[PDB]
Write a protein that binds this ligand. Structure first.
Ligand SMILES: Cc1cc(C#N)cc(C)c1Oc1ccnc(NC2CCN(c3ccc(S(N)(=O)=O)cc3)CC2)n1
Ligand SMILES: [Mn+2]
Ligand SMILES: [Mn+2]
Lengths: 400, 554
């Protein structure tokens, strides 16, 4: 085994990201992990000659796990992991009956990382009250979280999987970051038995290994823009319905509001439902049920996801590349943050399974509230890109 | 002594070569001073004589006070050298410090000149002492240690110092040592006998590693003046805050006052700085005299009272839990106190921030709770238990109904007036027997002429004219009109997503006067329902207002 040489771009410089303050339990949880890793030769204490920094966090049943935020590095590595060694995405995966996800991160700890690239993997375990200098380390092996690790490993991964794949040609296996996506049309017990067989292939070589047990991507359906059913329609009830439909007409080709606009009245007054409006309404209903005409996935373009707080433990979301032209819409159903972090994880997983990439999330929360809390509930090995937005009150209403 | 410690490898910036700066002809006094200076350094192995085999040069200088100081201009080399890791990520807060029986402050002698520079890098630190009138080849030299004024000296020094302490640290986990530049602060629960002995074990550990300290019996008596604080054994405080008695205040005087008050705010409760800040607003020369308002004179009076008596703070006991209390002290103004045992404050704080243009006490308090939450994780590594001037029901009613997601940790209501409340609540469904006001407010982009107005389900119609108003301003004055002319129960229809958004958000304070006027109206009303329709879509009521509203100018 030798090292695959890595390069950012001749102009692109490494990451220099601040470490978010960490709680006592997390710093202590990290010192344990980082010491064992240093002893095992996975990492190495570093000096000031390394001006680079990637944040570290600790996650969770009872065992603590080191999560490293490779967002900036992955952005700066891109050419290496997308073009130079890009893993292809199977269109089949999203069609499979059941999809099991397995953590294959332990495999990267066996492959050495290009000696010339290691400086960019620098991270810091901070000190409480800044009394001690703060422990610096860098990777020697392939790090978990960095998109370059699965790119390098793919060659060794294809070897491992070769028998299983030959033996089960109707099983689909995708590799996204530290995880394996395994899909089959098999009955549940049989799917589970195939996963177990798979674990063992990985066990030789060396691989121990908001969502249920597995994902069911064929059962995944778009939450339509719903038009309420009523026998009593007020002036306000129609006004809402007109505004909702008008907004949908910007996305859905075929939506008409004319017949409804055909009715200075008091909001509270009860206007009776016309023949042409009752038709238009029922017609629009059948349009919003079926997917959007004209919107397609452009691989070159970035995915964008919006989430709305619907209250009572309900959340709504929409995946698009070009604003409001929806690729997928859905829903998610104890505290606002735990719920959002849950919703985020679910949307990102669906996104991975469907397009082979994570969306940039538009978070209906204050920047600081999120950064402080997300880690307490975060459970994934990847971290999506996120921006903090103010949900326009209108969009919440339109998506129920 | 030059520490035996291994050298930190240094490189230049990629695609760059070393400095080749010409040494300016220096004065005879300066030449005589520099040679004398360099000779004593050469004998100590800090520098080494070189030939014209080396092609790099940096200008040297000299300054006087009878002592002569050697000034090296690393400006170019620093531009050419690689960036390093940030020396320290923060500074300790006295509130986070633990109680210790005894202290010793050791200061490291000739720090940068006591640490070796990477052999492969030395060539670039080359400097030349010119000959008199520069007629003959000067005396070429290069550093073997960290040069003074060079980019990586703080990084490389602190890095070394840390590695040198690491063994001693592991060997003495019950001893706290704080590193800051060429200073070392040692604390222990050991008695003056065992402590003084451990001090010498350290001084010697530093010596085995080429680092000299001062000497014994230099040690002082409490308080220990550290980083702008007074460090007593059981307490801490900010160093004497002198609030100047001045007749006339200049921009510079006010600026410094705000800095002193903000610094005092760490342990002195109820310190206010709003009114004094309002003064600094605008251009104004540093020396320009600024007449104090009644509000600023009142604020300074209150500040003088708080600072009339010395207030102290306690150290952190990691066995106990943190408790943070917040108090409202005017619009935008919030004051907090963190303690573990009732009113034995570890630290104090103020918070005044306007995230966006418009906000309410609930959003304001939540925002403060966050600022304190982060502050706590930084200082103590754990979140506090909160005591808030808001009813649990007031919170519940707000955060469930709001579209933004929030979560605040363990908190309890404490009855500390003024209490945080929602000054009004918009209706959920349209009101019956309450006049429906369809509003609109079109403005011309060129003539700047506004035309805010309304039409009602009761045939009332008013169309006012505005001067130099945006389409935003008019869409908002239309709502203020509907609010003014209406009864106690009102329905208001708008085509402005902007206006609705502002209003939906339930603000109780705003940057715009129009909004403050609208808020005042909202507070007064018994019931207010606010609906939205898409403009130009021909809505029965909306279309009707647009006719008389858009009539002339756009
Ligand atoms: C950040 C920092 C700064 C300084 C300083 N100066 C010292 C250390 C250890 C230092 O670094 C730390 C680190 C952890 N805890 C403390 N607690 C200090 C609080 C004040 N205390 C003290 C004890 C006796 C007396 S006395 N004997 O004068 O009454 C005066 C003060 C010494 C320990 N300091
Ligand atoms: Mn309007
Ligand atoms: Mn308008």
């Amino acid at each position: 085994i030798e090292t695959v040489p890595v390069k950012l771009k001749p102009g692109m410089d490494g990451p220099k990201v601040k470490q978010w303050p960490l709680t006592e339990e997390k710093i202590k949880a990290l010192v344990e992990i980082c010491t064992e890793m240093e002893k095992e030769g996975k990492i190495s204490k570093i000096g000031p000659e390394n001006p680079y920094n990637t944040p570290v966090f600790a996650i969770k049943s009872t065992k603590w796990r080191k999560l490293v935020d490779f967002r900036e590095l992955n952005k700066r590595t891109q050419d290496f992991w997308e073009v130079q060694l890009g893993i292809p995405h199977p269109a089949g995966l999203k069609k499979k009956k059941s999809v099991t996800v397995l953590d294959v991160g332990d495999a990267y700890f066996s492959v050495p990382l290009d000696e010339d690239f290691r400086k960019y993997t620098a991270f810091t375990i901070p000190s409480i009250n800044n009394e001690t200098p703060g422990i610096r380390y860098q990777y020697n092996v392939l790090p978990q979280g960095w998109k370059g690790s699965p790119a390098i490993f793919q060659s060794s991964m294809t070897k491992i999987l070769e028998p299983f794949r030959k033996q089960n040609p109707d099983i689909v296996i995708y590799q996204y970051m530290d995880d394996l996506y395994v899909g089959s049309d098999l009955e549940i017990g049989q799917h589970r038995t195939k996963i177990e067989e798979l674990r063992q292939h990985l066990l030789r070589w060396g691989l121990t290994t908001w969502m249920g047990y597995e994902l069911h991507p064929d059962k995944w359906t778009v939450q339509p823009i719903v038009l309420p059913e009523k026998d009593s329609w007020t002036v306000n009830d129609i006004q809402k319905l007109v505004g909702k439909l008008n907004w949908a007409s910007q996305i859905y080709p075929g939506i008409k509001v004319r017949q409804l606009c055909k009715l200075t009245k008091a909001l509270t007054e009860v206007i009776p439902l016309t023949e042409e409006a009752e038709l238009e309404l029922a017609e629009n209903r059948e349009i919003l049920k079926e997917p959007v005409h004209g919107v397609y996935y452009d691989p070159s373009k970035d995915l964008i996801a919006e989430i709305q707080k619907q209250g009572q433990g309900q959340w709504t979301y929409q995946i698009y590349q070009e604003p409001f032209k929806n690729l997928k819409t859905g829903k998610y159903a104890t505290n606002d943050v735990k719920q959002l972090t849950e919703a985020v994880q679910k949307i990102t997983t669906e996104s991975i399974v469907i397009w082979g990439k994570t969306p940039k999330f538009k978070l209906p929360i204050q920047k600081e509230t999120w950064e402080t809390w997300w880690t307490e509930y975060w459970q994934a090995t990847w971290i999506p890109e996120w921006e903090f937005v103010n949900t326009p009150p209108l969009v919440k209403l339109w998506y129920q | 002594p030059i520490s035996p410690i291994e050298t930190v490898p240094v490189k230049l910036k990629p695609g760059m070569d070393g400095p080749k700066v010409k040494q300016w002809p220096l004065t005879e006094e300066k030449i005589k001073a520099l040679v004398e200076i360099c000779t004593e350094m050469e004998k100590e192995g800090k520098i080494s004589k070189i030939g014209p085999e080396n092609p790099y040069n940096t200008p040297v200088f000299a300054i006087k006070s009878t002592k002569w100081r050697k000034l090296v201009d690393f400006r170019e080399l620093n531009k050419r050298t690689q960036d390093f890791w940030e020396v320290q990520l923060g500074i300790p807060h006295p509130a986070g410090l633990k109680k210790k029986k005894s202290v010793t402050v050791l200061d490291v002698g000739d720090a940068y000149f006591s640490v070796p520079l990477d052999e492969d890098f030395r060539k670039y630190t080359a400097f030349t002492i010119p000959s008199i009138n520069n007629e003959t080849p000067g005396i070429r030299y290069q550093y073997n240690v960290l040069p003074q004024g060079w980019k990586g000296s703080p990084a490389i020094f602190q890095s070394s110092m840390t590695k040198i302490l690491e063994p001693f640290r592991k060997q003495n986990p019950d001893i706290v040592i704080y590193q800051y530049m060429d200073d070392l602060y040692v604390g222990s629960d050991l008695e003056i006998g065992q402590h003084r002995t451990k001090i010498e074990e350290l001084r010697q550990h530093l010596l085995r590693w080429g680092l000299t300290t001062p000497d014994k019996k230099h040690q002082k008596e409490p308080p220990f003046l550290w980083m702008g604080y007074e460090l007593h054994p059981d307490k801490w405080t900010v160093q004497p805050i002198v609030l100047p008695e001045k007749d006339s205040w200049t921009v510079n005087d006010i600026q410094k006052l705000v800095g002193k008050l903000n610094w005092a705010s760490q342990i002195y409760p109820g310190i206010k700085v709003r009114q004094l800040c309002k003064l600094l607003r605008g251009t104004k020369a540093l020396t320009e005299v600024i007449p104090l308002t009644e509000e600023a004179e009142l604020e300074l009076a209150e500040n003088r009272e708080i600072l009339k008596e010395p207030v102290h703070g306690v150290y952190y006991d990691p066995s106990k839990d943190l408790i943070a209390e917040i108090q409202k002290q005017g619009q935008g103004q919030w004051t907090y106190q963190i303690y573990q045992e009732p009113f034995k404050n570890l630290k104090t704080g103020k918070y005044a921030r306007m995230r966006g243009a418009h906000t309410n006490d609930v959003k304001q308090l939540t925002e403060a709770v966050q600022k304190i939450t982060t502050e706590s994780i930084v200082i103590w590594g754990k979140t506090p238990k909160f005591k808030l001037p808001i009813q649990k029901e007031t919170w519940e009613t707000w955060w469930t109904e709001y579209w933004q997601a929030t979560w605040i940790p363990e908190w309890e209501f404490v009855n500390t007036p003024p209490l945080v409340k929602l000054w009004y609540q918009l209706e959920k469904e349209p009101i019956v027997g309450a006049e429906t006001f369809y509003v609109d407010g079109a403005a011309n982009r060129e003539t700047k002429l506004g035309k805010a107005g309304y039409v009602t389900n009761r045939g009332r119609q008013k169309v006012v004219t505005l001067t130099d108003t945006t389409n935003q301003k008019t869409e908002l004055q239309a709502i203020y009109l509907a609010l003014q002319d209406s009864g106690l129960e009102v329905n208001i229809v708008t085509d402005s997503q902007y206006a609705l958004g502002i209003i939906q958000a339930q603000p109780d304070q705003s940057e715009s006067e129009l909004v403050n006027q609208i808020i005042e109206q909202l507070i007064k009303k018994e019931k207010v329902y606010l609906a939205w329709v898409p403009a130009h879509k021909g809505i029965g009521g909306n279309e009707q207002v647009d006719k008389l509203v858009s009539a002339g100018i756009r």
